[PDB]
Amino acid sequence: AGSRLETVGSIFSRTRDLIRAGVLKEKPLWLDIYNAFPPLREPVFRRPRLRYGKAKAAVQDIFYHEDRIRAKFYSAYGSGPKAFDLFNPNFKSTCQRFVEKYIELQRLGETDEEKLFVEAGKALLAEGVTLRRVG
Amino acid sequence: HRFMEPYLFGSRLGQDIIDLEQTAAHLQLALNFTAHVAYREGIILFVSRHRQFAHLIETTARDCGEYAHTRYFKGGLLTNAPLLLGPGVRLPDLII
Amino acid sequence: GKATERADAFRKAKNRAVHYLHYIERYEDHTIYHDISLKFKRTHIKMKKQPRGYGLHCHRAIMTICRLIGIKDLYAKVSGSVNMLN
Amino acid sequence: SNEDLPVPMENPYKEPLKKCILCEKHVDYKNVQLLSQFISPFTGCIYGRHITGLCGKKQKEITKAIKRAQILGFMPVTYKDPAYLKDPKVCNIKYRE
Amino acid sequence: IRNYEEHMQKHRKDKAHKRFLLMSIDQRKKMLKNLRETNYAVFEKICKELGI
Amino acid sequence: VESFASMLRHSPLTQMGPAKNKLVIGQIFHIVEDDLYIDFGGKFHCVCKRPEVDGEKYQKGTRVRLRLLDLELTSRFLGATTDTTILEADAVLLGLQES
RNA sequence: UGCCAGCCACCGCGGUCAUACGAUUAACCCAAAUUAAUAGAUCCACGGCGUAAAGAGUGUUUAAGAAAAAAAAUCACAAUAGAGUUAAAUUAUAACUAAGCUGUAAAAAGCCCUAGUUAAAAUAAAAUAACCCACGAAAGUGACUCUAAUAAUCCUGACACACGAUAGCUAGGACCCAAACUGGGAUUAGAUACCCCACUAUGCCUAGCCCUAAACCCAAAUAGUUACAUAACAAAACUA
Ligand SMILES: [K+]
Ligand SMILES: [Mg+2]
Ligand SMILES: [Mg+2]
Ligand SMILES: [Mg+2]
Ligand SMILES: [Mg+2]
Ligand SMILES: [Mg+2]
Ligand SMILES: [Mg+2]
Ligand SMILES: [Mg+2]
Ligand SMILES: [Mg+2]
Ligand SMILES: [Mg+2]
Ligand SMILES: [Mg+2]
Ligand SMILES: [Mg+2]
Ligand SMILES: [Mg+2]
Ligand SMILES: [Mg+2]
Ligand SMILES: [Mg+2]
Ligand SMILES: [Mg+2]
Ligand SMILES: [Mg+2]
Ligand SMILES: [Mg+2]
Ligand SMILES: [Mg+2]
Ligand SMILES: [Mg+2]
Ligand SMILES: [Mg+2]
Ligand SMILES: [Mg+2]
Ligand SMILES: [Mg+2]
Ligand SMILES: [Mg+2]
Ligand SMILES: [Mg+2]
Ligand SMILES: [Mg+2]
Ligand SMILES: [Mg+2]
Numbered sequence: 001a002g003s004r005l006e007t008v009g010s011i012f013s014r015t016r017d018l019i020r021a022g023v024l025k026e027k028p029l030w031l032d033i034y035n036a037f038p039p040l041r042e043p044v045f046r047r048p049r050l051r052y053g054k055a056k057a058a059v060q061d062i063f064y065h066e067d068r069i070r071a072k073f074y075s076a077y078g079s080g081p082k083a084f085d086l087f088n089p090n091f092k093s094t095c096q097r098f099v100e101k102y103i104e105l106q107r108l109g110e111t112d113e114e115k116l117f118v119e120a121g122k123a124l125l126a127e128g129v130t131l132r133r134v135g
Numbered sequence: 136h137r138f139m140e141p142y143l144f145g146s147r148l149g150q151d152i153i154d155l156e157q158t159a160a161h162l163q164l165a166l167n168f169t170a171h172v173a174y175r176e177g178i179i180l181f182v183s184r185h186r187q188f189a190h191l192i193e194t195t196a197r198d199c200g201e202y203a204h205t206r207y208f209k210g211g212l213l214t215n216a217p218l219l220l221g222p223g224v225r226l227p228d229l230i231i
Numbered sequence: 232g233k234a235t236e237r238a239d240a241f242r243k244a245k246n247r248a249v250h251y252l253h254y255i256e257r258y259e260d261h262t263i264y265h266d267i268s269l270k271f272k273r274t275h276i277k278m279k280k281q282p283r284g285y286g287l288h289c290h291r292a293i294m295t296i297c298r299l300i301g302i303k304d305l306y307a308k309v310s311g312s313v314n315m316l317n
Numbered sequence: 318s319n320e321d322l323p324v325p326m327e328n329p330y331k332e333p334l335k336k337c338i339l340c341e342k343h344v345d346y347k348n349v350q351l352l353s354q355f356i357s358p359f360t361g362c363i364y365g366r367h368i369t370g371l372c373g374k375k376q377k378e379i380t381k382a383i384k385r386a387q388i389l390g391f392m393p394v395t396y397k398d399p400a401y402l403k404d405p406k407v408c409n410i411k412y413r414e
Numbered sequence: 415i416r417n418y419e420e421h422m423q424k425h426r427k428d429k430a431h432k433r434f435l436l437m438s439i440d441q442r443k444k445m446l447k448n449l450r451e452t453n454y455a456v457f458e459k460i461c462k463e464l465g466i
Numbered sequence: 467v468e469s470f471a472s473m474l475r476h477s478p479l480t481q482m483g484p485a486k487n488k489l490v491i492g493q494i495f496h497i498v499e500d501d502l503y504i505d506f507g508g509k510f511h512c513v514c515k516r517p518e519v520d521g522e523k524y525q526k527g528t529r530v531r532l533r534l535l536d537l538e539l540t541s542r543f544l545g546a547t548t549d550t551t552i553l554e555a556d557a558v559l560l561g562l563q564e565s
Numbered sequence: 566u567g568c569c570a571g572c573c574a575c576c577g578c579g580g581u582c583a584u585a586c587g588a589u590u591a592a593c594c595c596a597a598a599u600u601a602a603u604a605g606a607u608c609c610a611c612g613g614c615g616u617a618a619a620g621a622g623u624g625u626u627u628a629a630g631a632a633a634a635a636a637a638a639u640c641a642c643a644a645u646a647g648a649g650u651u652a653a654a655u656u657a658u659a660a661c662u663a664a665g666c667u668g669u670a671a672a673a674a675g676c677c678c679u680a681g682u683u684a685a686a687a688u689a690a691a692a693u694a695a696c697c698c699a700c701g702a703a704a705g706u707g708a709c710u711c712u713a714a715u716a717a718u719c720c721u722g723a724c725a726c727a728c729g730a731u732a733g734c735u736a737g738g739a740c741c742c743a744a745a746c747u748g749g750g751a752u753u754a755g756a757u758a759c760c761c762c763a764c765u766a767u768g769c770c771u772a773g774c775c776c777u778a779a780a781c782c783c784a785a786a787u788a789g790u791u792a793c794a795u796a797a798c799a800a801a802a803c804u805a
């Protein structure tokens with residue numbers, strides 16, 4: 001009638017083996033689609049072993065040079081007066097504007113962090129935004 | 136989960152980010168496979184045990200003309216089909 | 232298959248047997264492809280490939296399974312526990 | 318060629334670790350006031366970590382400093398010195414309910 | 415080794431230091447044997463000077 | 467065609483940084499007698515109680531202001547291989563959105 | 566025939582309806598041999614050591630053997646042996662008041678040279694800190710201070726050297742308190758036991774011996790891997 005073993009192999013592997021054996025005389029309709037279009041990974045059962053020892057995960061942290069600049073702004077001025085809005089795909093945050101002007105300012109050849117940070121704050125003040133320093 | 140490591144682009148401040156490039160490749164085959172089994176007059180069942188989209192998924196299957204099962208799943212449904220449903224029952228050819 | 236009566240025990244076992252089916256590859260339909268050495272729980276069973284002439288020199292339970300699968304040339308040695316289920 | 322990929326850098330948002338009350342400060346067996354604030358005024362017992370809140374380094378030093386003053390003759394043993402009963406409260410235990 | 419012997423002569427019933435004294439002698443004995451099988455000229459001078 | 471990596475860099479979520487103490491506006495999508503299910507654009511929905519002042523104007527689709535503390539509440543207990551999520555988020559109400 | 570007479574290589578049979586004893590019919594298997602008895606061929610571990618028989622109480626070293634890629638002297642805290650010291654409690658002892666005081670599920674016995682309060686040596690033991698997890702090779706160590714001090718330029722190793730809780734022995738000193746043995750009371754059919762009261766060896770210091778533990782984290786030392794893979798249970802599996 002069929003095979004009900006989950007761990008032997010994929011559904012494709014068992015179906016074509018039974019058909020080749022001669023027990024299943026009616027080819028399932030989904031089988032033809034599978035041969036033409038195979039998935040990226042064949043569905044083979046594998047036991048979720050727990051990781052022991054010095055082995056760690058290979059997932060990398062998502063960090064950018066922008067994040068380093070954002071840390072200084074958040075540490076000094078805290079959260080900006082503008083309210084973050086995640087519904088707008090093209091939203092421009094106050095911190096993001098600070099980073100963008102920070103990148104443009106450092107293209108002039110300035111290396112000192114203090115000069116870059118102070119001038120960016122003064123430049124933002126010229127645009128009308130509020131940068132009340134925390135503490 | 137340990138098996139989802141290859142599909143993860145990375146982790147952002149302790150929050151995992153799924154690599155959409157691999158999602159697009161998988162979703163392209165999934166939709167392509169779904170249509171073909173529907174083209175050949177195949178039974179498609181929507182299964183989702185989540186009590187926030189149960190009505191939406193149930194209505195989605197009605198519009199498509201296909202079947203949905205978002206309620207409690209009985210133990211011997213797909214395996215012991217003849218006793219649960221009826222003497223001669225055609226098993227679904229695809230489950231979503 | 233387990234039941235209160237021996238006659239009912241046979242009936243349950245037969246019907247439930249066809250639900251669990253394997254496909255065993257047979258090199259030239261007379262032998263396994265290569266020598267296999269495995270240790271399932273506490274049962275050590277070692278099987279070896281053989282030519283056509285010398286066939287079916289294995290444990291009496293293995294010979295019964297081999298004739299059903301179709302293998303006609305095999306050598307098997309069972310070490311450790313000889314429990315039928317294992 | 319893609320410059321949008323993340324770089325392997327340490328976390329820039331690592332908030333500095335919390336400092337204990339007596340961190341970077343020198344405890345002593347001669348200042349009774351500092352040692353007296355960590356003693357129950359009614360009984361004279363020494364509070365644990367879950368009440369004092371000090372770290373693992375300044376808890377042992379306070380314990381050793383207190384016991385040195387007990388024998389050398391600088392503070393009472395079975396009660397808190399009443400002269401230092403009005404010092405600011407640092408422990409997290411409340412008796413009156 | 416000389417420091418342990420001075421300590422042992424005072425505190426006779428100490429057993430932790432007596433174990434250290436015996437192991438220190440054994441380690442020096444092992445190292446002297448290794449030196450002898452590699453550089454005999456240096457081993458003779460060390461043996462004569464230290465009184466070992 | 468814009469590469470997926472470029473999308474994350476300019477996304478508002480990445481520009482937010484740490485989720486603690488961030489002023490984020492949200493929209494209410496479900497109303498109970500005392501609980502307001504608010505969606506702030508994150509993965510899950512935060513739950514807050516109706517304030518005693520101007521409580522009659524908190525209706526479906528109304529925009530409010532939130533202070534995110536944890537993007538997703540999740541903790542680990544002993545004997546648990548995997549953390550037990552709460553499928554919610556933690557936030558507080560600072561008032562209604564000033565249109 | 567009726568657990569009788571008897572049978573069996575192992576498991577077993579016979580206790581008035583035995584395919585197992587004895588006889589009969591029939592059958593099976595060897596065959597000029599068959600069966601029994603004793604020797605021999607063969608047969609244990611290139612397998613195992615948390616729970617099964619099995620990691621020896623600990624460390625160093627000799628004989629011996631490994632090295633082969635890389636890399637590695639540690640460390641706030643209660644190691645140890647000396648010297649000095651005492652906070653809280655208890656007792657000798659004195660004063661005062663009271664006639665009772667101790668004890669149990671309930672009592673008796675004991676005490677009345679007693680109890681409460683105030684004043685107070687010696688001996689012994691080390692509240693809270695400790696919801697910390699440090700030191701030592703192990704057994705062990707956690708009141709304070711000082712002195713001396715924790716091997717190896719950083720592998721394995723015995724029957725050899727050194728050590729080893731507690732109980733026990735020999736000699737001297739100490740004795741608050743606890744306490745095998747012993748005596749009394751109670752319980753019980755009996756109680757040379759559990760429960761109550763008294764007291765000794767002894768627990769303590771100095772010197773010597775004994776060398777035993779569920780000395781158990783029942784998991785040997787040094788380098789490693791998370792691959793392969795669930796007997797059961799427990800503290801996941803494995804390689805050199
Ligand atoms: K004490
Ligand atoms: Mg057997
Ligand atoms: Mg006979
Ligand atoms: Mg008869
Ligand atoms: Mg017989
Ligand atoms: Mg007979
Ligand atoms: Mg044993
Ligand atoms: Mg054992
Ligand atoms: Mg050993
Ligand atoms: Mg040994
Ligand atoms: Mg040698
Ligand atoms: Mg001594
Ligand atoms: Mg009486
Ligand atoms: Mg008295
Ligand atoms: Mg006396
Ligand atoms: Mg401890
Ligand atoms: Mg050592
Ligand atoms: Mg050392
Ligand atoms: Mg050695
Ligand atoms: Mg001893
Ligand atoms: Mg003793
Ligand atoms: Mg003794
Ligand atoms: Mg004698
Ligand atoms: Mg004596
Ligand atoms: Mg005595
Ligand atoms: Mg006594
Ligand atoms: Mg008696």
Ligand SMILES: [Mg+2]
Pocket residue numbers: none
């Ligand atoms: Mg022990």
Ligand SMILES: [Mg+2]
Pocket residue numbers: none
């Ligand atoms: Mg042992």
Ligand SMILES: [Mg+2]
Pocket residue numbers: none
């Ligand atoms: Mg051991």
Ligand SMILES: [Mg+2]
Pocket residue numbers: 785786
């Ligand atoms: Mg060893």
Ligand SMILES: [Mg+2]
Pocket residue numbers: none
């Ligand atoms: Mg070592």
Ligand SMILES: [Mg+2]
Pocket residue numbers: none
């Ligand atoms: Mg190791």
Ligand SMILES: [Mg+2]
Pocket residue numbers: none
């Ligand atoms: Mg089971």
